[PDB]
Structure formats: C-alpha cells, structure tokens
Symmetry: D2
Subunit: 312 residues, 4 copies
Amino acid sequence: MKKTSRKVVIVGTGFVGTSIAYAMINQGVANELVLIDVNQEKAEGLDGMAWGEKNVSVWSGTYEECQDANLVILTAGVNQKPGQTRLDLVKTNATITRQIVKEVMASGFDGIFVVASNPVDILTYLTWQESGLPASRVVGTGTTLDTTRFRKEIALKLAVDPRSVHGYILGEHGDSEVAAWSHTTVGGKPIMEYVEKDHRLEENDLTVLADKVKNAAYEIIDRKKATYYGIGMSTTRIVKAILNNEQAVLPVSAYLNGEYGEEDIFTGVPSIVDENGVREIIDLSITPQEKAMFHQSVSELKAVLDTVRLEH
Amino acid sequence: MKKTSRKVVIVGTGFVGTSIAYAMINQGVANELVLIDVNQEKAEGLDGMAWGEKNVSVWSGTYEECQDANLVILTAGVNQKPGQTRLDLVKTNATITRQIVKEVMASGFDGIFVVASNPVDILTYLTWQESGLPASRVVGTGTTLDTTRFRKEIALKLAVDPRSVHGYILGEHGDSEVAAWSHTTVGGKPIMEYVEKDHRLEENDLTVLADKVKNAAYEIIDRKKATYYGIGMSTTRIVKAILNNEQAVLPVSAYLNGEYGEEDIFTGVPSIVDENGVREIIDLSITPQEKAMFHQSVSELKAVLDTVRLEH
Amino acid sequence: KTSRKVVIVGTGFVGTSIAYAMINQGVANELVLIDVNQEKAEGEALDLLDGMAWGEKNVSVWSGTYEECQDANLVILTAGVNQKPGQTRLDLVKTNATITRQIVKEVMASGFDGIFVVASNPVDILTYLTWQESGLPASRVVGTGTTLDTTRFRKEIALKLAVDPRSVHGYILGEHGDSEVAAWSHTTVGGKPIMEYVEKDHRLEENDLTVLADKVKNAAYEIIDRKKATYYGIGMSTTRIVKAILNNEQAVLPVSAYLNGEYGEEDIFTGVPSIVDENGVREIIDLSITPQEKAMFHQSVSELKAVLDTVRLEHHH
Amino acid sequence: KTSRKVVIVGTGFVGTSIAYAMINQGVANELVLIDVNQEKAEGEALDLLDGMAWGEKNVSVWSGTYEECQDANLVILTAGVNQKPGQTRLDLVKTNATITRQIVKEVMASGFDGIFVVASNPVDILTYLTWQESGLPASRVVGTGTTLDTTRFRKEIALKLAVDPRSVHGYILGEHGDSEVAAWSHTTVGGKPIMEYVEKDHRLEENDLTVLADKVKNAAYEIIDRKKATYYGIGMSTTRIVKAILNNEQAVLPVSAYLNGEYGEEDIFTGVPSIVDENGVREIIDLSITPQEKAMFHQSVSELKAVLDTVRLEHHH
C-alpha cells in the first residue's frame, strides 16, 4: 500500500522538546511523533502524550527511529550553571549537539534538520558541518519568535490585526538583532511614514518597540512555571511549512552566500520554506544603518562560532 | 530525502468530481490533487483552482498519475436521460466505471479506492471485482451523506448540537434505507426514550424525520445551480479519515461477511476507517424490525447487482 | 448579551452563496434570509441543509421578513441584476439603485440600527445610496469594494513568484472593474517591493505586471460556479468583511469606504485599504501611491461620480 | 454591538491556563484578567504575549479592576487553594468558600448581570455558593463539573478500542473525584453500547472498566504541566464551556448543573449531562442509569451535601 505518513523525531525531551512536542500534537502536524530522551543533558524534566485530539501516535524511542524519519528536531542542551561562563556553555551544548547529530546520521537518516536548541545560529552551523547535509536541509529557528513578537507589538501600538503587519527582526536573536524598520509595513504602509509624514509615531516609539523584543529574548524566570509556548509555536510553525510545502516566508536560520553582504554563516533572514527546506533567501535592500548593525551581528556570531566550529 | 506528500486522483471532472475537488482543495486534505477528465461520461464539461488558500498543486493528467497516487476517487458516470430505463442506466455506469478501474489498475496503481459514483453500492462492488484489490481498500460513500442529514434533522427537532447526536442510516441510500432508531442517541439518551417514557416525541415524528432524509436522496434538480456540497463534503470526509488515519466511524459502503445477517456485498454500515481503509464493521444489535428492513434493502441490492456483476 | 445576528437580503445567487460561506465559516449565530420580490430565489433547499449539516458550528438559519432586521447586528444587501463586463450599462445601475433604495427603506422601518454591508453591484454606487437612504454614519455602511480582486491580485502574484499568498501584501484600489488600480508601488513579497523584482533583480518585466493586472480585471464580474460559491467569490469576500466586523478584528481590508481627503478625493465610497472593526470602518489607510497610480485613481473616481450623479438622492435621510 | 467580553478572576495557575486556552481558541473578544489578593499571581507576562502573538484571533487582553465586570458577559471564578488528592479536607473547602463569597460579592457590586462559570475547587460546592451569593438564576451559574474527567473518560475508552474519541459518547456523573460515577450503561462506541463489548462480544471484561474508571479518577486533581496548560486540562475544559455559551451551541456538557428531581436528587449542583447555550444551562438530560449507578450517584450527592452544609449561606441573596 502507498503510505501517507510524515515522521518527525524530537531529540531532547526537556522543557523545549516537551513544549515543541505538545504544539506538534496539538496542531496534528505530523502523524508519527518519536521522542528521544537525551539524558540529564537536556532541558530538564510517557503517558503525558495521551490526550491529543486529532489522533497522532506518539512514542519514545532511540536514534534508529531516524532512518525513515522525514524531519528531526534538535532541542537538547543544558542551561548556564552559576559560575560557568557563556563560552563554556556554548562549548558544552556544542559537543552535546554534535554527538547527537553524529548518531542521528549513523541510523541512516536522510531528511531535514530543524535546530531549536540555543545558541541556535551556532548549533545550526555545527549541525550542518557535522551531518554533511546540504545547508538548505538544516534549518534553525532563527528570529521567527522574535519577529512574531515584533509584529504583535507593532499591531498593539497601532490597533490593527497583526496579520496586516509585515516586517522582520534580522540576525541572531539577542542584543545584536536588527529591527528592519525600513521594510516593516502596516496595511501596506511603511512604518517610517508614520513618523516622517504623519508624525503619529515618534522615533522613541520604534526604539521602545525594538527594545521590548530585544531584551525580551531573556525574560523567562524559574522555567517550571513558564509555558515555552513561543518556542514550541515558532518551531512547530517551521515544521508545518516544511511538511505542507507552504512556500512560506520565515526568518529562519539560513546559510548566506552574499545576501546582506555576509557569507558562510546561518542566521535569521526572510526565507522561503518548503518540502525541501530553505529554497532561497529574500535579500531586502535595508538601509546602510541596518546593514551596519546586521554586519555587527554576524561579526560577533562568527567570533563565537570560531570557538567551536569543526575543521572539516 | 524522505518525502511527505499525499497524492489523490479524482477520475471524472463533472459536477460531482468538481465538487469533491473543490472541497478537497478547500480543506487542504491532500498536497497533490490530480484530475482525470473522462469525456461526455461525467456531468458538464483546469482554470478554476486558482484560489487554493492552503497551497495545493492541482493539475489534469492521464491514468499515469495513478501509479504513485495513494488514493483514487471515482466520480464518473452519466445521469438518467428521458426514456432510458433505470436498469439501462445501471448498465451504462457499470460499464464506464469498470473501464476506468481497468485503466487505473494498468498504470500500476496500488493505493485505495473511494467510490462516489451512483449507484454507489453496486459500483463499489464492481470496482472491487475489476481492481482485484482487498475489499477493505475499496470504499464507497455509503450512507455518509444521509446520516449527516439524519443527525442534523434530529438535532434541529430537539434544539441540540448535532455533535451530541449519534445514529445511522443503514443500507443503500434510497427508499429502502434503514433509520436505525434503536441505536440513535441524543446526549447519550436513546431517542426511543423521548417517545416511550418522556412522550416528548411520537412515532409520527420519527417517520417524518426518516422520510425527510429518505426523500432527500432524490431531492436534487437544476444541476448547474446545485452546489453538490453534500457529496463533496461526504467524500472529502472519508478521504480525510483515510489519509489522516483517524480511525473514525463512518457509514461507508463496507463489505459485509455476516454482520447484520448479510454477506458478499458492499452497503452502508458504521465502519472504522483508517490509513488502510476499512479496518472493521461495527455490528449493531438492531431490532428485528430494523434487521428486516435491512434484509429487504440488501435483497434488492443483490438483484440489481446480478445484472452487472462480473461472472465466474 | 452575546448577540451575533446577521440578515441577508436577497436569496438569489449572490445572497445564497454569501449564506453558504457564512454557514461554512460559522461567523454569525443567527442567519436570517430575506426573499425579496426584487430578486428571484435560487439554489435548492437541500444545499442549504447540507451546508448547516456539515457546518462545524451550529448556526440558527431561517427565512424571515424585514421585522428580523430590528435586532439584527448586520444586514447584507445582495439584490440586483448582475453587472456584466464592458462599459457601465446605465439602466442596470438605475434598476439596482431603485431596488436598493426600496430595500433599505424597508430595513430602516423595522428599527434596524446596526451595520450595512453592500455586496450588490455596482457596489460603490449602491454603498453611497445605502448611506443616503439609511441616514446612518458613513462608517457603518460598508461595501465589498475591491476585496475579491485584491485577494485574486495577491494569489496571482503568489503563483508567479511561487510563494505563499499570506506573504504577499498589496491592494487593488478604486472601483473594481476595468478602471481599477493595481497599487504596485505598495505591493510586497516577504517584505520586498514587487518593483525591485523588475527594477533591479530583473526577474520580471513591465509586461509581467500588465498581464497580472488584466487577469484580475478580466474577471471582476465573472459569475462564480455554484460548486465553488461556498469556497470562493463574492460569498467569501463578504464573509471576510462580516467576520472582521463581528470579531472586532481591526483587519485591513480594501472595502468601499467613504473618503474625506485621502488619495486626493472626497465624498464617495470606493476601494481603499481600511481598518475594519466592530463599529465598521474605523479609518482609511492613505498610501503614498505614485503620481501615475494616483492619476489612474482620480480617473476611476471621476467615472464613479459621473455615474453616481445619475442616481444620487438630493434629500438624505 | 458584537459584545463578547469575558473576565477571569484570579491570575494563579488555574486562571492563567484558562487565559492561555481562551486566547489560543479565540473564544472571547475581550479578555480581562483580575489579580486578587486571595490568589497569588503566577506565569510570565512574556508567555501571555506569546499566546496573543500566536493566537489566530486578535483578542484584546488586559489586567483590570472589578468594575470591568459591569458590562462583562461572563465572569470566570478561578481563585482558591488547589485541592489535593485524598479525603476532602474541610479547611480547604472553608477557605475557598470564603474566598469565593468575597469575590462574588465584589463582582455583583460592579453591576454584573451575565453568567458565572466556576472552575475553582471543590467545584460543585463553590458553584452552589456562587448561586447563593450572586442571587442569579441557577441556570446562569455554571460549574465545570465532570467535563475534564469525561473528556479523559472518552479518550481512554478510545485508546483501548483503537477508535476516534468523537465516536465515543458517555459521561462521568456527580462530583468529580474518587466518588464520581462512570455511566457505562450510557456509553457508546460508534453507537454500540460499551456493555455489549463485555456481555456478548467478550472483547473485554469487567476489570477493563474498573482499570479505566480509576485511571480517570486518579487524575481528577493532578496539577497540569504548564507546557501543556494551553492544550489540555482545566483551561481547555473551562474554555469548552465558555465557547458553548457564547456561541449558543446547545452542546451537551456534564457541567455542574442545578438538579430539581433528575437522577432522584434535588437542591445541589453536580455533574450531569446538560444542554448549554447562551443563557447558560437550558436543561438537564436525565439518563435512565442503572440502580447500581444511581446508587453510586446518590452516595456522591450525599457526600456533597454533607460538606456543603458546613459552608452554605443561611440567607439567599
């Protein structure tokens, strides 16, 4: 019989993997959902999957399950312990992810990678070089979440449905991300026109918005009370676009080859996502100032990446 | 790279096939939706799928597409023209459908059949004989449509949400169909109690209800002004349960082997539908009176089937 | 209380398809269908029953009289002869203007105090007359405008660039038809101005836009198939607007809105991006279109006012 | 106007999870969250923003004061100490009765005249007190009852027989917890009495039922995972009921309804299949359960009344 199932494997069953799994189940995006428990090196944390509405068979397994899997979601990695340095955390999660990817490939997997573990841009690159798969088949969550927040906040300030707002947060989601105001529109109207022609908006309004999203990239507190809904939703959004061949434009972590003036790196940029992963990148002609900040962001990205990238 | 896509082929591009296709596109049930146009053996003679909200590639092709297709929907057949006898109409469509199934199988197809053509039960059986596939892989629409009307009508009479109503129309949808009141409940309450205990409903109320559905199986007219929405929705419902492996209970045309006291024929009975088609039939202990009417319906079914069933 | 009552006036093709789409999406709790003498009823009763039976939401549907408009939150005007392609047939306008005014008189006399949504054609004209006859605030009389054409506009652009329609943003402005304006200067794909695709990346030529715009215009009056009426066409577009209103969505829709200066024009209803919420049109988004587009827009409006002048009332209600 | 305003009192775990589900399903137009001194706030503000940001419907959310209850259509009571598995515990009931009365007193003082949905525990008792304190008709005070347990009930039955939950119809009756009654006599799978699967087809025995009912009973109080709160648990159940009301659904839900003779009991709110619409509980479907089940049901009610007697008001408002 000609079979019609989409198999997704979630490596890492901690807070993130758990949240992603629930969102997957809730949206019935995949028919087969396999959860691989990594260890005490996850996001900390069986029957908790039996409540799905639109029936999806979820079970626990091993890396062997990655053979026939279409997409594997990486969510493993630990949190920064008091004392440990940021660089030591990057190194830690870099060796965890690499090991996981090594085993995933061992099984014979030949699908698509969706990286959700942090630092996303770096782990996505390590995933790429470790799996040897084509760049377009290794997809990081990029600034999908930050962008969704960006749009909602703008929507809230101008009392409009977020769906009428189009814009992006570019780069690595953190203090270096770039609010691309030049290509942010509301009802088709450039946001800068709200400040440089209508004056219904001030310059400080944009900065406050960009900062709300900017330093929101670190607001979670005790983690046991957090829902991880944002990460679950954004990751599920990407999986869905891949599995349904949506050709959707998402600011996922994509490999650049000149677009935005950068190259040989994965980072948040508007990209068309389909059955085959990232088809191409949309290169927006952002302003010199935005390009400058984008440069700053990729520069810092590469510096940290150099501390863990493989030699071949 | 593992591919995640469901391919459905709709043979017959007349009113029915067109309506099913539109419901399919609208619900994004399949990703690849191929349309094989027969001839003047459909219902009224490419440029109309330019609205698919949820990206779905639709195109017209030959019986070739059936090779890698997962499910094929049969909708071809002509309507009774003035003068022609009912029997001659049955022979006409039996020959058409049979020729179609022969083609579809010659391409190397090995998926699942969903018969929407009328007479449904007969054609479902012919499809089974010609294709040579297992009975569980040939699925007729049975009394799915009638049952949905049946429940809505009951819901309207009692002022409740139809989702709270469970019951079925059994057999062949026509004047012989059987309204199984014995196993019809509202909010879990047997419909007979509203009559034989609360006296909030009388016998005539059921008969009128059963007759509205009964006389609805022949309540179509203009054709070009009809929407064929019911048929589109019914067929799409079945295709959806199959592709999504819902294990849903639908009164599709299933092959009986003793249940209900009948055998060797396909007729409307509540059945569990999954990715493999019909897994089993729920055999309800209907009352002697209901079983008697069912017998009558199956009896007439076989008499007409004998005039077209493949011999030896 | 939780009142979500919608009345549809006219049970012909347009009226019924709007009903099918409303039922399918379950936007209202109550859907009253009013059969008028100025419109011949179409579509079997069975197709109405199947819509309700297969509708995910349980909505109350029934045939009634104008009395139902008294406590209705929204009334949809659909009666009228179908406007066919070509130059504007003036008698068809006069016929529909007459039908529209009579119907609106009946509606107001029932004590209705909600919002009007006009789906009849010529839409812009009938919206203006509905406003004059009803005496209601302009923000509470909403025409379907260029909503349908804009949806088609984005879909075609999407197909051409092989991208998801949700990533395309742009609008068709003015009176939907041969004089409509494709605002290319404010159409983007994933944030990228459609014009860059031609004035830089050179992936599209000027002729690619023209072919696209014509595809949209050469269908602004096409009669939708009944087997598709539930999923596409005037029915869907009207339901989109009714939905934005009933859910206080604040959606940006190119409905027929009353202008008072934006786009360089005043005192007319025509297609322009507008924020639609529970009180109707809250405000109009005034895009800085190019002189060329604006000129094409001015012409569309001139054509509109010339025709409007033949049926406009001298005494408002 | 299209008024769909809901107020949630208490921003603790229960309150917030109900908010997440409400926002996710976009059931309400306006969602007000009231932080009271009787309940400690929990959950990040960021998680509220993501909920709204990823919610398909654009709902206006905001933290407010009791005065927001004046024009509210529905108020959800959620404040109270979590009831842990085991023997009731009178001090918890008394603490929450007190908390509930004070809150209900504040809500009525704002001029509220809508419907109350109680999701605090012990639900049946707090629903009875809410009815007493508010002075509203019993049909307008709705407890969440055994809805969650019923959903669980059907889900476990489905998994066991490898069928889709929607094909299963049945209910858990009475007070949800160790004394709830699984009404097997009126539980069907595709229309087939679950009992036949035992007393005929031998597809499973008496012990399969016991194992299944306990599974449901052994989680009737468990604290839901925050990462799942938006999709399952009290949040979803409460939202299901709120949805049935706002949409005048006429759904059959086992909410805490006021009995007046059905099931042989009177003057108490408890879990029973009830038709829920825009005016609250329209009527109770009185199932002809078996003497054995009714007996179990009688015991559950007796327990309820015994504990209710320790906190019931002597003067009805």
